[model samples]
Target: KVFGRCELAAAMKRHGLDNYRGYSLGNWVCAAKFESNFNTQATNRNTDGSTDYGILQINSRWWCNDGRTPGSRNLCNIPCSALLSSDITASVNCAKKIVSDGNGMNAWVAWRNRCKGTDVQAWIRGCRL
Candidate 1:
């Protein structure tokens, strides 16, 4: 399931992503814009032989169990399939864990590379939250 800009921000906000740490709602929106383009079903395989899942692109290597990540830690304790849906709860759960693990919003390579130091507020213009 794909969502438009503000719509995705609203959903993530409902899940409590807004300023969860030091990151803002627009930062999440910016990360999603580059990570999965707000596409809930997005998946990408890494050169390291792991897969990234869903809007936040949670990694299969340590974050999720794809049943084939080879020694997956499954730190999030959920199947990779959980992140591949429109529900988004699973994605947010793991995202929070990733941040709680001390990476902050830097848990996402997309966030660091694309969203960092940008005018992230532009991603949330016309947003209701």
Candidate 2:
């Protein structure tokens, strides 16, 4: 499922990421935009034998277990398939655990490349979420 821009922004805010760890909601919203364009089933297989799953692109190497990421920790304690679901509850919960793991928002490289140094507030300016 692909979310509209404001729709996703609202969802992220509702999922407890608003002003999380000093990063505004738009920071994550922007990152999610570039990561998977708000598509719930997006997947990207890396050459390193690991895969990224869902809108936030959680990685199999460290987060979800795909049963194929060599030496995976499955820190999220949920399968990658759960993240691909349209509900996004699993995905949002996993992402919450991810940033709390000491890396903060830097865990997603997409945020650094695309969301960093940008006026993220504008990403949700027109939205009332």
Candidate 3:
């Protein structure tokens, strides 16, 4: 498991993600909360046969390799399993790259479905970062 939201906000700020690539810290934390509930090892098998990996739920379809899945572009060039750890360095880096790739927070379906255009102050409120 990863740290709590307060610590997470601190870390995100430390990593220059407090306002990463024009997206606010609220957006990242909100997206991560919905994506993995702050659980590093979280994985979800979607109906489309693709899997979501780790805190940001990087997809096996394009971002990471699950060893068994076929035709993964692995745009992040990291194994899916690498994301499922408490360190989160790999996941964070990959996520930054993903946003830089022009998707913004929309790269994550959870962000699109749940966080987009919504007030996510709750994700960062009281964190005091």
Best-matching candidate per TM-score: 1
Question: TM-score for model 3?
Answer: 0.91
Q: For residues 1-129, what per-residue lDDT tens digits would candidate 3 score against the true structure? A: 876987877777777777788888888888888998988899999777889999888988888888766766788999899999888788889888999988788888889999989997777888776
Q: What Cα-based lDDT does every candidate model obtain?
A: 0.90, 0.90, 0.85
Residues 1-129 of candidate 1 have per-residue lDDT tens digits of 999998999999999998998788899999988899899999999998999999988899989999888876899999999998889899998998998888788878889999899999899998887
In model 2, what lDDT does residue 59 have? 96
- Where is model 1 poorest over a 10-residue stretch in terms of lDDT? 64-73
**For model 2, how does the per-residue alpha-carbon lDDT over 9-101 read when each residue is reduced to its tens digit?**
898888888887788989988988999998989999988989999999999999999999888789889999999988888998999888888
Better of 1 and 3 by TM-score: 1
- TM-score ranking, high to low: 1, 2, 3
Clashing pairs in 2: none
Residue 64's lDDT in candidate 2: 93
Alpha-carbon lDDT of model 2 = 0.90
Prediction 3 global C-alpha lDDT: 0.85
Q: In model 3, state the lDDT of residue 16.
A: 75
Off by over 4 Å in 3: none
